[PDB]
Amino acid sequence: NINENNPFLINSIKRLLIGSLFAGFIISNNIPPMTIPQMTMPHYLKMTALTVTIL
Amino acid sequence: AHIEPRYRQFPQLTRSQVIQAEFFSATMWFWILWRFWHDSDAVLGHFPYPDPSQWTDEELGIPPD
Amino acid sequence: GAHLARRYLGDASVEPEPLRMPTFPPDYGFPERKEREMVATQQEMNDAQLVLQQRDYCAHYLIRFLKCKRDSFPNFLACKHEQHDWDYCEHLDYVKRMKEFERERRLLQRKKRREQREADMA
Amino acid sequence: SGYTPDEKLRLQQLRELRRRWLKDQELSPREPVLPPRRHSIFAFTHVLIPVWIIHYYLKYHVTTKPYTIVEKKPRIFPGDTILETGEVIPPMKEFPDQH
Amino acid sequence: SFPKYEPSRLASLPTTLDPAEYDISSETRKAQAERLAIRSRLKREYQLQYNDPSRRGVVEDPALIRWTCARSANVYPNFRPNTKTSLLGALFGIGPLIFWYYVFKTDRDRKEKLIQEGKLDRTFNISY
Amino acid sequence: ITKDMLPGPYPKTPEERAAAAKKYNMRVEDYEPYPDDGMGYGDYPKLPDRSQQERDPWYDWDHPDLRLNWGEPMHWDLDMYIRNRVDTSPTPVNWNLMCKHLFGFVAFMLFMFWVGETYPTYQPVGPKQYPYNNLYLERGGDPNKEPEPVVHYEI
Amino acid sequence: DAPPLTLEGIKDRVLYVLKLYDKIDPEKLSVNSHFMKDLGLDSLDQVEIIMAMEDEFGFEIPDIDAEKLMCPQEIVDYIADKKDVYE
Amino acid sequence: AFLPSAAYLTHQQKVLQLYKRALRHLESRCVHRDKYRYFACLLRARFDEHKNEKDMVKATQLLREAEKEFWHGQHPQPYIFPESPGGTSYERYECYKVPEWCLDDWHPSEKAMYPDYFAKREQWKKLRRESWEREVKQLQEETPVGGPRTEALPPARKQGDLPPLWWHIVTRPRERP
Amino acid sequence: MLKYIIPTMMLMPLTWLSKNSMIWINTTLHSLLISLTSLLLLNQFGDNSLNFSLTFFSDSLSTPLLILTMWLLPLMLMASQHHLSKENLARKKLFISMLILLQLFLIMTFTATELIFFYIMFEATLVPTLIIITRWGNQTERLNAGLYFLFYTLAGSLPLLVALIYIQNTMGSLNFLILQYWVQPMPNSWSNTFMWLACMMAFMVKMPLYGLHLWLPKAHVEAPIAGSMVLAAILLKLGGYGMMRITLLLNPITDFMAYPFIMLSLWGMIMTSSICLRQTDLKSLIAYSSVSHMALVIVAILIQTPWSYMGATALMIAHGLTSSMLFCLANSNYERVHSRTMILARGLQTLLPLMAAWWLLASLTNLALPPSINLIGELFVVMSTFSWSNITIILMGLNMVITALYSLYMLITTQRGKHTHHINNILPSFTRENALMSLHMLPLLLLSLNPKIILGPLY
Amino acid sequence: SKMELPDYKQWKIEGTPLETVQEKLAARGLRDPWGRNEAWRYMGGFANNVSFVGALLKGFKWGFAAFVVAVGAEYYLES
Amino acid sequence: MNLFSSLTLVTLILLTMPIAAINFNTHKFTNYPLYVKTTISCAFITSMIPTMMFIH
Ligand SMILES: CCCCCCCCCCCCCCCCCC(=O)OC[C@H](COP(=O)([O-])OC[C@H](O)COP(=O)([O-])OC[C@H](COC(=O)CCCCCCCCCCCCCCCCC)OC(=O)CCCCCCCCCCCCCCCCC)OC(=O)CCCCCCCCCCCCCCCCC
Ligand SMILES: CCCCCCCCCCCCCCCCCC(=O)OC[C@H](COP(=O)([O-])OCC[N+](C)(C)C)OC(=O)CCCCCCCCCCCCCCCCC
Ligand SMILES: CCCCCCCCCCCCCCCCCC(=O)OC[C@H](COP(=O)(O)OCCN)OC(=O)CCCCCCCCCCCCCCCCC
Ligand SMILES: *C(=O)CCCCCCCCCCCCC
């Protein structure tokens, strides 16, 4: 009985899908700086989160 | 017409759910590649990390005694 | 992160403690060492309502970036240059802090060589 | 082995009575016999009339009392012009250019 | 071989790992049949009243009324003051009272001694 | 209900034990009372101290939520051994082994947090440098007093 | 969602699962083919048939009911009674 | 162990129930269908090895160490069907299963909304109250002395009679009300 | 205060001259009119109490208890008219006369300017309550419950009589308004120790103190519903009222006499709340919860800070309404299943949804859900006891776990789960019953809008 | 209403991993009596499901095409 | 100042209004869940204005 074709379901997942694509970008470029971001670090230490996730 | 249930076989797909699913998958990969093309430093690194061992004793003030 | 292995598994007398340094005077090794120049006036970064963590020696780029971010609304993607200016000067401040760390480590190496030379000489 | 003949007979009789009961839980085409009983009005009754009520309440009852709506004072930059004074905030000192 | 299951107070032994589960002896057959007969007689006595069309109310359960009377009213007429109950009533009845008495008394003596020596930071404390 | 079906005192003679077992609707060989230490139990049966989760759920109970029949002598802690509460059901891992594994894991993690607190990681940098005497007026220093001059130099 | 079961549909599905079982020849099978007497199957085979019924319809049959469903019509009647078909 | 009709489980019944529990826990261990199907035929071979064992002490011993085998090799979270006890949807709809007698408590203005349903309910209630005395006297003329021995009930032996104690089995609520 | 005493007395010819079908309607109507008139007592001032005469006065402590007392009589008449429907007509009028007489004794108990008149009214309230319990209670143990309710109270109160006559002979007066100005400090002696015990132990019994509470899970349980309403909602609060009047005269010895009793409540509210986790009797669970809630009022009166008295009087009013509604809910199920065993009738939200909503609301007010005045009184007592000693938050916070854990268990056991199959006399909720639940809950929710009227003389 | 079930004779386990299972069972003297019951899961539209990197790279082809078109659009549009 | 605070309180009052609608009811609803969904969508739209003039 596999069926997901209700516009309620599709639109409700769709708006959070647009959120899960773009909302981190939009919010992170709209908020003001309240700390100082650490942006100078060695290359094994900058790539740590992505490498650990891939591993 | 709504989806009829099937028995021991692949269910009926609508054209709309398939094209929307493929469209948002292509949207995701477009966004990943686009922001990777433009930013390219939130992932790989913003500024070069200098080597402290390559620094001279003159600029750090280490008089030789 | 090799300095953690040098301080914890090696000796800590030559490695600089983070909580209390510089232990050497700032003029120790420098002919006429000049101060750091503060560009933003104390009243200017007071009236810009900056966070007290953010009122460092490079807050004038942050003031320029926040004025850009106010003036370029709703186009929130239109101040990448001022943001990169502030990020680059924070990077330069971080490089200066690394230079202070390496300076203190080299002077502790100098003191280690000094006391070993004094033990081997007399 | 499975059921005894008494168990088969009892389950058949209970099954017949149960299927009659479940059939008799159905509805008539007249049932339920009920007794005999503007495009954007949601933007008017639920939004705009509350904006009216809340603006009246805040303007003439809340802001007429001290320290009820206290706003953070706006952020002042070097190079601004004050609206209440006209006093131009003087711009920053020239930068020791880094790049 | 396999680690033996060690049953506890809050994690009992399984039905299939109990060595009395595999009793084919005639006395256990008699016990299981007599428990079956008691349970069937109580079941029949329940569902004669439960399926009654004339009955409109509560099928009273004398097991339940018996349980509530044992939990509530039978406790004092079957109490005897002896060594065990006296030590448990002194340990659990006045013991924590003595304990919290000395704790709160020591705390308030320390606090009052700090206050009347001008030592406790009581700078903005004006709600009490 | 009447007098001779209510709970009574502790049975000592075997005929009183048999009348008690007949009262609580159970066999004499299965009827154990609580030990007569004077705690207030009387003749009430010590049922074998199981939760009601362990009862057979596919059996047709008179009370399906409680898994309990009508007329069945209830446990003394029946309100305690309901399925909303304390379970005694058999666990896949031994109870002592569960206690040893959980205590070892929690104690080892707290010990390693103490170790990492004693040996913290950091970055090869100096202190963050702030102008105006480490921001003396900003941090709440009074303007009538004057701080000692905190001076940071170029490097 | 949730299509209603009928006696004919349940009968079709039970006989369909039994026609896909390689210890029953699908031409001898009928609705009253007793598994131990007519079809000549083991009690282990009866347990596996009831477990395939559970995997087919999605609900567990208890063992006190599983050890007594000895023809496919008993299985259809049991699923009917536990699912209330022909409402 | 604990059954309504029988006082006990036979040895054969214990072997069957251990076989079914072992295959369910094996399916919980062996998620994919081909891999489960392979190890399930292997377990069927392990149960076929000791099928023709005539020493009942030896068969009971093998069943006991097979239970210890199963208890070592069980899954910590076995697969439970959603409406099976321990399931995610188990006893979910019990809040919607209102009993039939509450329909007697309805107001006549909300009974008049369904005239045919309550007119049809009246003959069910009438059939029940005329069958009740016949099925009570059927139960008392057939139950042995000392009470009933098992919880099984007799069927309707005559024509026109209904089986005894039938109302709360027939008029139970649906599984999806 | 004579404008409330005379209408309460005119309720006696109003009930003894009414027609036989009319004695509930007329008494309900005119007791609601007296309760409407009770709001004139809210003429309170920030400095001066509302001092009517030589005999009667009303500050902001007596005023909410008066409003609650005069409001509780119509609600008791609604709660008690069902189970006394088959009662004899003259015994029905005697029941109503005992409730009227109890209201009469209470409304001049709370306004008694002089303390021996306070004592006479305070002990005059025993006799209608005793008669209601032992005459219209349902079970055999109503007689023993009446004996316990009488003889803990009198054994507490007769040393209070001796001590108040001693204050009369020493200070010259027992006017509370005079004793606000002539109060002498009470030094450390054994004579003043037993002075303190004689002035306090009667109210310790009436609160009840833990260890002296044994009369209550009989007297609240064996009573009829109007008896349980007036015992829980008003008659426990005579102890707290009398403590707040009498601890003026007991300084500074109270600052070291309070130490045992504070322990007896701070541990006792842990115990009785724990006891509510294992109560099979629902009405006994509500009784032990009343002991658990009044233990906080005992602590708040003994530590004698302003936040503590404000939280204590807020918690007294809030607990009056909440426990009265909880007993009325327990009676609404007892009138159907005819057993007070809580495990008997389950799953009642499937059968009675609006009554289960009332159960939910009374449970949430029992567990002190903000911003209810239950939470306001609870919270202010917790603030003042933290300022008293910082460790007490443990015994406070642990209490607030267990207070949740029996309140929702009472909600889960009675209303949730599968309904009981063999119980089939569960009628729909009568309009009288839902009216009773709303007349408890709606004032308790409206008082969160303006809680300053139930925060005592030192708000 | 009346639903038509498909034929039971079309579910054959050749070409599926049930065939590998039956061969490894016949290698030690066993036979697989529930193969055709499980045969529908490995046949029809549920045969040849994607790999995990094929799951993640769903829509990567059209996304890469739209990426190259947009990069060429901004590379021409700057001039 | 007058826009910000007004739409701020409008968001909360607008969210409270279907609670008053479900408590002040007689009829079987003409899709009350659609009403609450429309209400929360419009409260989101209303709350975006103080958010944007915070970003400014
Ligand atoms: C002076 C003027 C004042 C005007 C404003 C009113 C102020 C409060 C007054 C009392 C409010 C409650 C009364 C209604 C509920 C009780 C009866 C009921 O359940 O009916 C259900 C029924 C609707 O349900 P249904 O589908 O028909 O059938 C029910 C089902 O059987 C089963 O239903 P169910 O179980 O599905 O639903 C029950 C559900 C159950 O809902 C819950 O359990 C959720 C609530 C708790 C958690 C969430 C709230 C937590 C606290 C935050 C809110 C307060 C502060 C908010 C402000 C911002 C922060 C400070 O109840 C609600 O949702 C009620 C919403 C309002 C709840 C108020 C708080 C009660 C919780 C416990 C105490 C909390 C602390 C005290 C708060 C006091 C605030 C003043 O309601 C009605 O028919 C309404 C009847 C008439 C109501 C009259 C209200 C006024 C009474 C006073 C009269 C005199 C003054 C004149 C005022 C007139 C105003 C018009
Ligand atoms: C609920 C059960 C428990 C109830 C507990 C009730 C309180 C417990 C203590 C009560 C003590 C007796 C009344 C004291 C009145 C004090 C008035 C006063 O001025 O005192 C100072 C006076 C002082 O005398 P004086 O004031 O005339 O003298 C002038 C002042 N000096 C002393 C400086 C010269 O005290 C006394 O004269 C004696 C007081 C103690 C009395 C001891 C006997 C009674 C013992 C306790 C009995 C408790 C209840 C027993 C029943 C239990 C149930 C069956
Ligand atoms: C920064 C600091 C951080 C510190 C962290 C460490 C400290 C806390 C340590 C843990 C303490 C709480 C955990 C233990 C109690 C858990 C109770 C509970 O939820 O039990 C659940 C149980 C049934 O649930 P379950 O069996 O899981 O369900 C399976 C599905 N049938 O439900 C039941 O059986 C119902 C039981 C109802 C009565 C409960 C009685 C016990 C109450 C305990 C209160 C503890 C208060 C501690 C106060 C501390 C104050 C500082
Ligand atoms: C020295 O190494 C400084 C970095 C901080 C301490 C070591 C952190 C190790 C984990 C992060 C890198 C992981 C690489 C796979």
Resolution (A): 2.6
Contact present, I125 and I235 (Cβ < 8 Å): yes
Contacts of I281 (CB under 8 A, 6+ apart): E68, E72, I221, I340, I341, I342
Q: How many angstroms separate the CA atoms of I412 and I396, rounded?
A: 24
Instruction: Identify which of C20, C65, C21 has the alpha carbon closest to the alpha carbon of residue C40.
Output: C65
Classify residue G29 by its DSSP letter. -
Contact present, I78 and I28 (Cβ < 8 Å): yes
User: Which residues on neighbouring strands pair with residue J71, listed in sequence order?
Assistant: none
Ligand 3 centroid–CA I369 distance in Å is 20
Classify residue I58 by its DSSP letter. E
Contacts of I256 (CB under 8 A, 6+ apart): I188
Classify residue D92 by its DSSP letter. P
Query: How many contacts (CB atoms, under 8 Å) link H and I?
Result: 22
Q: Which of I392, I393, I401 to mutate to test the pocket of ligand 3 (most atoms within 8 A of CB)?
A: I401
Chain B's closest residue to C102, CA to CA, is B52
Is residue K24 exposed (0-12), middle (13-18) or buried (19+ Cβ within 10 Å)?
exposed
Contact present, I445 and I372 (Cβ < 8 Å): yes
- Angle at the Cα of A49 from the Cα atoms of A43 and A54, rounded to 5 degrees: 105
Q: From residue I181, give the alpha-carbon distance in Å to each of C115, I175, I233, I379, J54.
A: 82, 10, 32, 32, 90
Sign of torsion over alpha carbons H30, H34, H40, H46: negative
For I150, other C-beta atoms within 10 Å of its C-beta total 18
Residue whose pair of structure tokens reads 């709703």 in the numeric block = C74
- Residue I58 has phi, psi (to 5 degrees) of -145, 115
For residue G86, the one-letter residue type is: Y
Q: Where are the beta strands (DSSP E) in I355-445?
A: none
Q: Distance from C75 to chain B by nearest Cα, in Å?
A: 17
To the nearest 10°, the Cα dihedral for E97, E100, E104, E105?
50
User: Which residues on neighbouring strands pair with residue D88, listed in sequence order?
Assistant: D81
Chain A touched by B8 (CB under 8 Å) = no
Instruction: Identify which of G46, J12, J46, G14 has the alpha carbon closest to the alpha carbon of residue J22.
Output: J12
Catalytic residue (one of G42, G55, G63, G84): G42
- Report helix, strand or coil for I31: helix
Q: How many angstroms separate the CA atoms of I104 and I99, rounded?
A: 9
3-state secondary structure chain C: CHHHHHHHCCCCCCCCCCCCCCCCCCCCCCCCCCECCCCCCHHHHHHCCCCCCCCCCCCHHHHHHHHHHHHCCCCCCCCHHHHHHHHHHHHHHHHHHHHHHHHHHHHHHHHHHHHHHHHHHC
> Which secondary structure element, helix H or strand E, spans residue E41, and what is its range?
helix E26-50
Chain G touched by F58 (CB under 8 Å) = yes
The two tokens of residue E97 are 């009272």
Q: How many angstroms separate the CA atoms of D38 and E76, rounded?
A: 74
- Residue I281 has phi, psi (to 5 degrees) of -90, 125
F119 closest CB neighbour out of C8, C18, C56:
C8
For I284, other C-beta atoms within 10 Å of its C-beta total 21
Contacts of I434 (CB under 8 A, 6+ apart): I354, I355, I358
Q: Distance from H81 to chain J by nearest Cα, in Å?
A: 19
Partners of residue D22 in chain G, C-beta under 8 Å = 84, 86-87
User: Following DSSP, what letter does each residue of I123-145 receive, concatenated?
Assistant: HHTHHHHHHHHHHH--STTHHHH
Considering only CA atoms, which residue is closest to atom 30 of ligand 2? Answer: I191
- Residue I373 has phi, psi (to 5 degrees) of -70, -15
Alpha helices in I18-61 (DSSP H): 23-37
The two tokens of residue I286 are 């509500």
- Report helix, strand or coil for I367: coil
Q: How many angstroms separate the CA atoms of H51 and H47, rounded?
A: 6
The two tokens of residue I311 are 């939280």
Q: From residue H89, give the alpha-carbon distance in Å to each of A9, E22, G2.
A: 22, 35, 15
Considering only CA atoms, which residue is closest to atom 22 of ligand 1? Answer: K23
Cis peptide before C25 (omega within 30 of 0): no
Partners of residue C46 in chain F, C-beta under 8 Å = 138
3-state secondary structure D42-67: HHHHHHHHHHHHHHHHHHHHHCCCCC
C42-49, Cβ contacts within 8 angstroms, sequence gap of 24 or more = C42/F132, C42/F137, C44/D77, C44/D78, C44/D92, C46/F138, C47/D75, C47/D76, C47/D77, C47/D89, C48/D75, C48/D76, C48/D77, C49/D75
The two tokens of residue D30 are 């007249």
Contact present, B3 and A5 (Cβ < 8 Å): yes
Contact present, J41 and B38 (Cβ < 8 Å): no
- Report helix, strand or coil for I51: strand
Residue whose pair of structure tokens reads 């089986």 in the numeric block = H163
Cis peptide before C18 (omega within 30 of 0): no
Ligand 1 near I113 CB (within 6 A):
no
Instruction: Identify which of J2, J44, J8 has the alpha carbon closest to the alpha carbon of residue B12.
Output: J44
The two tokens of residue K53 are 């003039």
For residue I53, the one-letter residue type is: S
Q: How many angstroms separate the CA atoms of I86 and F86, rounded?
A: 45
Classify residue I57 by its DSSP letter. E
Ligand 2 centroid–CA H140 distance in Å is 73
Query: Which residues is chain H interrupted after (C–N above 2.5 Å)?
Result: none
Q: From residue I64, give the alpha-carbon distance in Å to each of E91, G57, I32, I107.
A: 42, 65, 16, 11
E107 closest CB neighbour out of I260, I391, I422:
I391
- Residue H84 has phi, psi (to 5 degrees) of -75, 150
Helix, strand, coil proportions of chain I in percent (round to 5)? 70, 0, 25
A14-37 in b/e form (b: 16+ CB < 10 A) is: eeebeeebeeeeeeeebeeeeebe
Instruction: Identify which of I33, I61, I39 has the alpha carbon closest to the alpha carbon of residue I118.
Output: I61
Q: How many angstroms separate the CA atoms of C113 and J1, rounded?
A: 95
Considering only CA atoms, which residue is closest to atom 15 of ligand 4? Answer: A48
> How many separate domains does chain I show?
1
Residue-number span of the structural domain to which G11 is assigned: 1-87
Chain D's closest residue to K47, CA to CA, is D47
Ligand 3 centroid–CA E114 distance in Å is 37
Instruction: Identify which of I71, I68, I79, I73 has the alpha carbon closest to the alpha carbon of residue I15.
Output: I73
Chain I touched by F70 (CB under 8 Å) = yes
I428 closest CB neighbour out of H91, H98, H105:
H105
H21-59 in b/e form (b: 16+ CB < 10 A) is: bbbbbbbbebeebbebbbbbbebbeebeeeeeeeeeeeb
Atom of ligand 3 nearest to the CA of I277: 38
User: Which residues on neighbouring strands pair with residue F63, listed in sequence order?
Assistant: F68
Q: How far is CA I403 from the centre of its chain?
A: 18
Atom of ligand 1 nearest to the CA of I361: 72
Alpha helices in I137-281 (DSSP H): 142-171, 176-179, 190-206, 216-222, 225-230, 237-246, 254-266, 268-275
Among residues 86-125 of chain E, which lie with CB inside 8 Å of chain F?
none
3-state secondary structure chain F: CCHHHCCCCCCCCHHHHHHHHHHCCCCCCCCCECCCCCECCCCCECCCCCCCCCCCCCCCCCECCCCECCCCCCCCCCCCCCCCCCCCCCCCCCHHHHHHHHHHHHHHHHHHHHHHHHCCCCCCCCCCCCHHHHHCCCCCCCCCCCCCCCCCECC
- Residue F120 has phi, psi (to 5 degrees) of -85, 150
Classify residue H106 by its DSSP letter. S
User: Which residues on neighbouring strands pair with residue F153, listed in sequence order?
Assistant: C35
Ligand 2 near I195 CB (within 6 A):
yes
Atom of ligand 2 nearest to the CA of I212: 1
Ligand 4 centroid–CA A45 distance in Å is 6
Partners of residue K38 in chain D, C-beta under 8 Å = 42
Report strand pairing: I57-58 vs I50-51.
Answer: antiparallel
Chain H touched by J46 (CB under 8 Å) = no
Instruction: Identify which of H82, H53, H63 has the alpha carbon closest to the alpha carbon of residue H22.
Output: H63
> How many separate domains does chain G show?
1
Half-sphere exposure of C70 (CA within 13 A, CB side): 14
Residue whose pair of structure tokens reads 């020696």 in the numeric block = C57
The two tokens of residue D26 are 């159905």
Q: How many angstroms separate the CA atoms of H45 and C37, rounded?
A: 86
Q: Determined by which method?
A: cryo-EM
- Angle at the Cα of I51 from the Cα atoms of I46 and I56, rounded to 5 degrees: 140
Sign of torsion over alpha carbons I325, I327, I330, I335: negative
Instruction: Identify which of I440, I225, I441, I438 has the alpha carbon closest to the alpha carbon of residue I335.
Output: I225
Residue whose pair of structure tokens reads 């008029």 in the numeric block = H171
To the nearest 10°, the Cα dihedral for H29, H35, H37, H39?
-60
Contact present, I308 and I300 (Cβ < 8 Å): yes
Contact present, I401 and I330 (Cβ < 8 Å): no
Contact present, G52 and G21 (Cβ < 8 Å): yes
Number of helices and strands (H, E) in chain K?
2, 0
* Known catalytic membership, residue G42: yes
- Residue I415 has phi, psi (to 5 degrees) of -105, -25
Q: Which of I365, I372, I439, I445 to mutate to test the pocket of ligand 1 (most atoms within 8 A of CB)?
A: I445
For J2, other C-beta atoms within 10 Å of its C-beta total 7
Candidates D34, D38, D44, D47: best to mutate against K (most CBs of K within 10 A) is D47
What's the maximum distance between 2 C-alpha atoms anywhere in chain K? 46
Residue-number span of the structural domain to which I415 is assigned: 1-459
Considering only CA atoms, which residue is closest to atom 13 of ligand 2? Answer: I159
- Report helix, strand or coil for I59: coil
Residue whose pair of structure tokens reads 């009968």 in the numeric block = G11
> Any idea which ligand is nearest the CA of I361?
1
Contact present, I231 and I219 (Cβ < 8 Å): yes
Query: How many contacts (CB atoms, under 8 Å) link B and J?
Result: 56
Atom of ligand 3 nearest to the CA of F53: 31
Residue whose pair of structure tokens reads 């026609």 in the numeric block = G19
Q: How many angstroms separate the CA atoms of E74 and F7, rounded?
A: 7
Q: How far does chain H reach from its first CA to its final CA, in angstroms?
A: 34
Residue whose pair of structure tokens reads 């909360």 in the numeric block = K12
Contact present, I290 and I204 (Cβ < 8 Å): no
Contact present, I286 and I331 (Cβ < 8 Å): no
Ligand 2 near I163 CB (within 6 A):
yes
